[model samples]
Target chain A: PTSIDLRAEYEGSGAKEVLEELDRELIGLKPVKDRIRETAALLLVERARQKLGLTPTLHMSFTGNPGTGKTTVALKMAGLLHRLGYVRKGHLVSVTRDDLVGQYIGHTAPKTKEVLKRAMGGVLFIDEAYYLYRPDNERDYGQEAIEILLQVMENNRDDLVVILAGYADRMENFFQSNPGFRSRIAHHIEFPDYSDEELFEIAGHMLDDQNYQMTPEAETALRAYIGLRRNQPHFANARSIRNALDRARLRQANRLFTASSGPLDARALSTIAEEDIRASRVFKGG
Target chain B: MTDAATAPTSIDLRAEYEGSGAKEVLEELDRELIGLKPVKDRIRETAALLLVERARQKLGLAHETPTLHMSFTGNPGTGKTTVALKMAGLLHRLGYVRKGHLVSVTRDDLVGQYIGHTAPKTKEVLKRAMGGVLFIDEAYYLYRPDDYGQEAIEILLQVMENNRDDLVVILAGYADRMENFFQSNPGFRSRIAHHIEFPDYSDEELFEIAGHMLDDQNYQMTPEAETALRAYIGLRRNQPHFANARSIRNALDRARLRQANRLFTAPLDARALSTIAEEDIRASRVFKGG
Candidate 1:
């Protein structure tokens, strides 16, 4: 036994609490988040069983459009796996076709092999896997990269995990073309775009987190903006709501930065006023 | 020079020169150029013809096919440089020349500080462009009635004929200015056979490009987010250049980063994406009228 007296210094004492607060600020996608938590729990259970010489099985894929929070979910899954002890080194290695494949003859194979080696005993995520197919005459080393990937994936299946991601439909085709790929892949999760109410909840929750409460009228203005553009392909993500808030903040910031020949005052900028919020779009015009 | 001595020396000149043919290079460039389908295809075709003709002679064929050289005219951000690069790659791919060289010279790159310096600058560009495409961007600026820059163009005409097999000259500028320059310089206009125009992207294309950007970035759009984006789009629609991809890009970038910051703290919802509610779409403010 060892005895010691230790004194420690810490900065930003509320940082952890603030982070917890921030996490609470996030709304929607509870189902996905809960599934992730369950996956982590299962991994922990499987790892404990594996120590007693039992089999280990924990593999999954998230296929969705861009900005559906897949990456964030992946990050959570990595932490859960680490906690469960199934993954001794829980890291996410994401790459596209170009990252693993080189153009020249002797180049592509080694490049692919090296990535596999680096990604061993961890999750290797490949985005845009559909770009691998090539015709006979095209000047491409894409097939070479694919061949190397297939070999690596097979040989290292026991020790490593590979998650291929992209549009769900495209990924389905990708898995079909390489049926063996479908066998190796365990779980497939699809993220649907958010509805209007979900988008609003996100916007309001976000503003609340920033210590700015939106008046009913201001909320109305925001919804009006959303109603007009709701059907746009780019509208169904957290990114969209975040954009409107930023524009509003920028207007607030502009007021603070360029307040009419007066001294910089906290009272002037402490709150984003109703007039200021409404005038945000106008301020942007000039 | 007699045929025997001149032919060997002339053939060796390409090897001695560190230039590749334009056609092959243009082909390589076309493969890499993204999104501009029609313009890329046309440029590749023109570059290929010129290079194929050069390739036939290199194989010691008795006859050489006649081909046209082109000039590209357009406003800024219209893919001129991209197309020029494709042309250079295309010529090289067709075997018109051994080395695919693109000597891109603007007035700043060619016009000298003093009267006597223009010749050397022009000669340097030509030497670099030997056996390939010599692309003079902003060619109209090279002409001044009493200026020495005009001499550079005259010298180019002589060298072009001297090394016709290995050289292709492309003079590019704004359409109106180029037309006026061609009218004044009959010799310059006579050598130019084809013309290509790079127009601005249409508004629809710009919108499509914005969608593509979202796809590229993996940013899924919520319905509210879509509405806010469209409002931004609508605001941009009536501008002088409704189809400026650059502006659309800037707006998207601004909106996206804002969303990221806002969503980082809280779970995002549709309201987070909207600037206003449905009822306020047409609301207006007093503009201080009499």
Candidate 2:
């Protein structure tokens, strides 16, 4: 077949490098990984078209609970876009409704514009973006802010990418109201909550990064904690684990300092004891 | 009418205000608005000023019209809009404005979509608001560094200054937001003759509000229910999205729904139908700390 090497385009664009780094950067989220790869392939084929030339819409929706690595993935996606020569800056400008909407009239446009300006040639990720439109009260300025945002997103498709994120159900409700958003955002990526094991792995790497190791008993206790915490209120997947780890580290420091007057060995200083993990409110509440 | 050199005109300020029915409007505000002592006092003071201004105008004391432009600073549901309506009625009674009606609007109504569009719409709104109180809710929104809102601000400011005899413009928003607007748009602050603060409702006032709300709907809260409502208000005010009277109203609405559900299969009586019970209030997810 008289055809182009899509792999050549992928290798040539350094898109492959970004994809590999995504796998190495985060755990669990197999679906997100697959979606990213699929998009990369689409970009590669588009590059092959450019070798022949064509174009496409770039805006997307990353729907998930908080701490499912939505922003983390958006960061990588921006880099991927830059790698594929979609945006010039490859930076991710993250904002919420407050950042874009002004407290005063005439303030929203410039405030939104400032965020848009900062996000130009990159990705603009709006957290809990469903808040930008309030269907309950027709008497709100948020709708005004949304129109301005949609205007920029529509006109600046090539240079700018907008990502709207929030709870999956609310995002669905938002999209039902905002058909302008639904048609424009081609990639609807759903971020599944990370599994307990995935969260444990995320915790392990976090401690590893900080030059700490957990005792086997501490590891077992943490896994149990993760399982229990997952069912609790405001359970933010990896974010919850991160918070628990922070508390555990504090307890370890307190336990070690109280136990000894002599200087501790490096292993002891770096070790997270089982007692530290067991002392958590998550365990006591049981 | 008398000169200042002569004995001040023997006019009874109280008689004049009473005739104008300004006292009726003030009493209505008192009866209707819950626990806004400061806001009510401010309105009384404002009414006194206008009554005095009328006396001043009558005496021909060589005085120009006092500024009728005003500002209201408060949180949402703190009785700002309701007060504006009373003020409109007060202004009409005092003959400050010809029509007692309130033409309430936010920036969205005043500012148009594009250039050459804003001036006409804003001017049109101002024209309609003539001979009445033009109550601009979140008035700070008009002072746009952007062109259209700037145009609206210009027209508002122009009308506020030039047509003071015909129109009374009252600006309103949260305290700090109103302050920032005043800070940035000094024309408003300078033109504004009366600046009033509407304080947040006290917990007891909110409970009293719960009573009035129940009373308004011909519904009575049982003794246990009243205490439950107090607890509900205390818990709710600390939570996000609490808007004073608005939140209390929403809570009462939800509690009413629960009462309806409870009464659905029960034996019927007028008291059973109208009474809101403790179970209704405690049944809320908030009580369970959900």
Candidate 3:
């Protein structure tokens, strides 16, 4: 065997390493990946421009279905920005509407400010940002939270970058309602739902990472299962795949438990069979 | 009768004893609790039956011991958990199980985000609660139709039956919801031996509870403050999500916060600092029934 070529094997590029990590980890989302790379390239130029006293907008909007890796990509972007000298602190603080909006009248300003304060030097990824506005209810304190966030996003744009994330259609309406807030965001990235094959691959990756292998029969069964659950309600793309894999592993465990008497071998322990995947599908219709 | 003045006089001497016997724990409950007469009576009856059952088992006169599984049906902060802790202590002292510790878990703790996650999570909670009591708070949530909550419920039903010898599972939730929950799951309903109902505290009872809570913290509500609190409790009664003692505690906490803020702006004497005034109790407009 040849000796390992350390530098040859290594990509040796900082931003490329992160982008590759994203490509490897995320099963699908070609458009999202392309936009992220484009953003990284722009940031690289922005770095040079800033050295020569040119400022560029880094704030963004991520629109997607649930569990489509919006927060995941946001964290990666934070890391990418930190590596490229765009953001000093690359940490991500993810919060929902509840974290910013308070129950009483006097409560919301401090609550929103506290969350913004935490996300000052990093990315403030607000999931379900549409919930910040309520047209029907006049007494809603969510508007107060949005007003504070808008002010902070403008005044503290130097050190802080806020990412507003939620459903795509709703997010467009959210931006339309508050044009001033919408103007602050520099990038609008949309994450499409995963294809059936992509979901199957995601499941395979999950199983492989956990020291579990799926037989050919089991893979076919899982692919069919994914197809069945694709159009169902609450079909969160990668999240649904993870859920199906979890149930398959559980079914495998139970199958082993009830079938085997003595200690099982390593091969028996790690392999997920067709029956395991089939059992998980049985509880679907109900 | 301003019993608020004399409330703090009874110092809990048993607080120092870390490992209290079953009888001492029951004594503490009887001594410390201000209300819940029916709950106390039912607990006493269960204790008597268990003690007699233990005696009968030792004499080899009984083949099977009765199930200690109980259902605590009440609104929030009605002393369900407090009484469950005491029941665990009693069960521990009586040699019913190994450890007398109480492991409390809500639906979130039991139900998992995905499939294959709930069984291990539920089992982990059960493992921690072994030789003791497993208290499931808001257990009705485990009956959701769309999610993995039903899987958790199935796991729990199996565990309850299999570990009935050493483990006591207490399912607690609102009275109406729990009734519907049990009626839906007959297997779960049949296993529960005792149904302890914790009624909401009356306005007077809430006033006394508030006084005791304040007294414990070395603070006292003034006569005017006490009057204001009573009226507040009366207005709060039967309101939505009106957690009996819990609401009083929250009100007292808010009042103390208001008192601290008031004192921060203006320097007060030590006596005035310790006294919760009527103004402090009525600091916010929402509590004024506006």
Candidate 4:
């Protein structure tokens, strides 16, 4: 084969390499990764189909609990689809209750449709989509946004992909509450809360990325702590664990640098010192 | 009284040692109690008082007023119970009661709805607390205007009056609530003489606490880990509601699990102490299941 040109002209500038950097930064979420890849593939398939003047197939839904990385995954998916040529510009316009709903008349429809216009060739992820359905007594602009979104979703089905996300059970109920919303959604995916072990792994990956190491003794103490806390109500997710670690490290640091003594031993600087680890000595009423 | 059959001839040091779980707890206590000078001091005082009171009573000093009752008001998870345990040890060492035991009772244990239940529950807890300290957690909650909690207080007061030389009552809770509770119960307030306050740990104290916990557990933290930890800690010290020692304990627990998972996949490389990195202390943006 003859080598034509070393540098080729780009038809469309792809997404910034920062997208890959973001992907690298995000650890775990394999199921989300797979779904994102599938979404990207589907977008590519739609592009191919559109090239031949055929109907395209591109629709999806993401269901997950709060802080489960659903929004981040959705944003990543949008960028990937944009790069793969499913949409004209792979930008994302996300809207929650505040964005779509309005208190007064002649306000809600235009506000939501304007968002759709902005997201014409991209993705519009409507968070908490269930709020769109109006109940009997309460009067709100959710119905108007729903009406506008429904029409826009149908009209722009070829160019735009609408992803509705909310609490898993609520999403199911949303679909049951309104089959029209369900009918429009071609794909659905769920995200799960991290197990205690999984949370530890995630925290470790985060720590490793930042170059922190755990000592053996600290590890045992940590295990006992997790065993005690994991089953407790309101056990925080990755965020809480990270917060705890950050606090510990800071406490450890203060103990090291600001010590009345000049310098700490190599061991003192390196380990989760005996002075650093403390458990809550709660009264265990028998 | 000295010749009474109920009074023991000599001290039972073995019973006291075993009763407080001193041997095992002390093995870990030194590591966790670093930098808590005030807590240590109060514990020492409590232990000393208990021993003195026990000795005086054993000597048949029946007319003397009982030892001073204490009230420990503090925030949540501030090593209140741990300090209590250590106090038990010190008292045991000083030959306090035959058994350096502490009875921990909560409002739920004492404040019953039925007419006779509250008295019985309070008496039961006091029975366990005989010749030792009776620690009431959330003491304020046990006080009610309708006199439900009054029953427990009355039982406690009777015990303190009759067996003045035998029992000590420790009421603990949030400071403001405890003060209010104390103000309302003049009889109960009259019985309490000593008070201790445990405030939240400062950033520096928290760090010391974390280090102490590690040492107590025999964890060998790395210098790099320490550097990373300090950097992160400095960034978060001013943040509102930062976790205290309990929170640090929780973070360390997670880091250990992360290290264990690594070993499952590969041969254990470094000792467990060297495995956790400094970043483990930072809030993680990414999660495993996510």
Off by over 4 Å in 3: A1-286, B1-22, B31-35, B212-225, B259-279, B283-290
Backbone clashes under 3 angstroms, per model: 76, 1, 0, 48
Candidate lDDT values, in order: 0.58, 0.78, 0.74, 0.61
Q: For candidate 3, lDDT tens digit of each residue in B1-290?
A: 55332223332223322333655877878876666788888888887776666555555566666777899998876778778888888887777778888766666666667667777777776776788998887799889774487888887888777767678888888889999898887798778888999888777777777878876655777898888888788877756767787667667765765665454334223455567889988775547564
Off by over 4 Å in 4: A1-22, A46-54, A66-68, A131-139, A193-198, A205-218, A221-236, A246-286, B1-290
TM of each candidate vs. truth: 0.39, 0.45, 0.46, 0.39
Candidate 4 chain B has its poorest 10 consecutive residues by lDDT at B261-270
Clashing pairs in 3: none
lDDT (10s digit) by residue, model 1, range A140-250: 677677777776566655666677777775565454334346435545667666666777888778877887766667677666666654544444467767776787787
Q: Is candidate 1 or candidate 4 better by TM-score?
A: 4
Q: What is candidate 4's CA lDDT for residue B203?
A: 68
Interface RMSD values for all candidates: 20.6, 27.2, 28.7, 23.4
lDDT of 4 by residue, B1-290 (tens): 36555766675544654564544445455566645567656655555455546555665664566556777877755666666655555544455444677765566567666576677667765766677776777778777774388777777777765675467677777788898986887776677767777766776776776787666544556677676556555644444434456546645654544443333323121243234655554433222211
Decreasing lDDT order of the candidates: 2, 3, 4, 1
